[PDB]
Amino acid sequence: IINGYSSRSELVRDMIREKLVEDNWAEDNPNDESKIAVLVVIYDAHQRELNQRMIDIQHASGTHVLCTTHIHMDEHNCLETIILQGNSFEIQRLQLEIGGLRGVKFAKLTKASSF
Amino acid sequence: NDESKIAVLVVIYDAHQRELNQRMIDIQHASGTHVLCTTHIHMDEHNCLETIILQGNSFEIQRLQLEIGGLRGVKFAKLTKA
Amino acid sequence: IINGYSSRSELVRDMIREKLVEDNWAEDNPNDESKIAVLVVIYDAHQRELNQRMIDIQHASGTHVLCTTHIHMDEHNCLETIILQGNSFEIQRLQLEIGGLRGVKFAKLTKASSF
Amino acid sequence: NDESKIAVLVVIYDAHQRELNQRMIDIQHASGTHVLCTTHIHMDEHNCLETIILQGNSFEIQRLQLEIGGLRGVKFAKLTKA
Ligand code: NI
Ligand code: NI
Ligand code: NI
Ligand code: NI
């Protein structure tokens, strides 16, 4: 528990929450298109063509990208939170395509469900 | 290692719990430069999603995650670290 | 020109751009629901009930609010850019309802059209 | 009056002009703490909208608006001041 959680049943509640959202994604109509996720990306701020490729990829997915918020971290690094909505397949496709771009140093998905 | 780092806290919360978002905001304002910004999607009548971008050493980031994630009405609060 | 624009035809280009987006909003099918706008709001960070009311108002408009990005300016002030998509009427209704909340100090609309 | 202020620069630009967004990003990174964050909506196949939140005195804010608004491929660039 000591990054230091506060008590006994505090690390476990946090686990049941992302267990329950993770069980949601597994057994829910593969083809349900309202699921939403956050893709967190850190990338080289001056990799030729990288930003344009990421834009192109997001625009070709269209309806599946709600917005992106970008932080200029420093001279070398940008962080983006890209908010996605679609089925599991469309969301994983997008994560993988952005993850496989030269200059992307980090591309991690957080799955979010409605309650 | 007491190094400043960026992190994203993803929260889903009940769009109707009174005082919840006022509490979330008080915490973030009282944290000053450790919150960079928040983005919010109104997912449906009962749920809001926020991505809250944070900046600090891992102990400061942790204290923030605890404080926001422990609020009544918060259904999900998961942290991603640089 | 001196906030200081650079030359002669530089202040005027900037005027033709928001003339042309402003002429767009005036004579385009009142009922076209794809128009998008940015509502910029500055508000009292600790006005009882203000944030909840703003959320309620945005959730009741639903599909018409794409996202909001919030900056905690200081102890007393928050800024938000609320991105809206709808017809002119839905967008103006929303601006007015947020503008008439106790604690909102500033609520200005920027209309954005596709080219 | 040489006071730091917040401002929002709303930009619409061509989602296909090569080098445009790399230029926009270079300017913002080279401006350091005068850019707080950007939010981007992919409006359609040919247009992106960004809200770029800035911080600085009115001369610094102006220099930024000029630099970003003058880029080829930028179709609209309008500033809102606190
Ligand atoms: Ni950047
Ligand atoms: Ni909401
Ligand atoms: Ni705030
Ligand atoms: Ni775009």
Is A1 domain-assigned?
no
CB interface of D with A, residues 28-57, below 8 Å:
28-29, 35, 37-42, 45, 48
> Within 13 Å of residue D68, how many CA atoms lie on the same side as its CB?
32
B25 forms beta bridges with none
Is C1 domain-assigned?
no
Structure tokens at B19: 């005082």
> How many other C-beta atoms lie within 10 A of the C-beta of residue A48?
12
CATH of residue B14's domain is 3.30.70.1150
DSSP C89: H
Is A58 domain-assigned?
yes
Residue A103, sorted as left (phi over 0), alpha (psi -120 to 50) or beta, turns out to be: left
Q: Which of C61, A35, C83 has its CA nearest to residue B45?
A: C61
Task: Kindly report the three-state secondary structure assignment for every residue of A21-79.
Answer: HHHHHHCCCCCCCCCEEEEEEEEECCCCCHHHHHHHHHHHHHHHEEEEEEEEEECCEEE
d(CA D78, CA D69): 8
Q: How many CB pairs under 8 A join A and B?
A: 79
Main-chain phi, psi angles of C85, to 5 degrees: -140, 130
Is A2 domain-assigned?
no
Is C14 domain-assigned?
yes
**Shortest Cα–Cα distance, A87 to chain B (Å):** 15
Q: Does residue B2 sit at the C interface (CB-CB below 8 Å)?
A: no
Sign, Cα dihedral of C8, C108, C66, C33: negative
Q: Does residue C66 sit at the A interface (CB-CB below 8 Å)?
A: yes
Elucidated via: X-ray
| Alpha carbon C108 to its chain's center | 5
User: Which residues have beta carbons under 5 A from ligand 3 (an ion)?
Assistant: C 72, 78
Q: Which of C27, C41, C22 has its CA nearest to residue C99?
A: C41
Is A36 domain-assigned?
yes
In D1-82, where do the E strands start and end? 5-14, 35-44, 47-56, 74-81
On chain D, the residues whose CB falls within 8 A of the CB of B37 are 36-37, 53
How far does residue D79's CA lie from ligand 3's centre (Å)?
A: 21
Q: List strands edge to edge, sheet with B47-56.
A: B74-81, B5-14, B47-56, B35-44, C65-74, C77-85, C36-44, C104-112
DSSP 3-state of C25: helix
DSSP A103: T
Domain count, chain C: 1
Range of the domain at C12: 7-113
d(CA C54, CA B15): 11
Question: CA-CA distances (angstroms) from residue B68 to A16, B17, B24, C44?
Answer: 17, 14, 6, 21
d(CA A14, CA B70): 10
Q: Does residue A67 sit at the C interface (CB-CB below 8 Å)?
A: yes
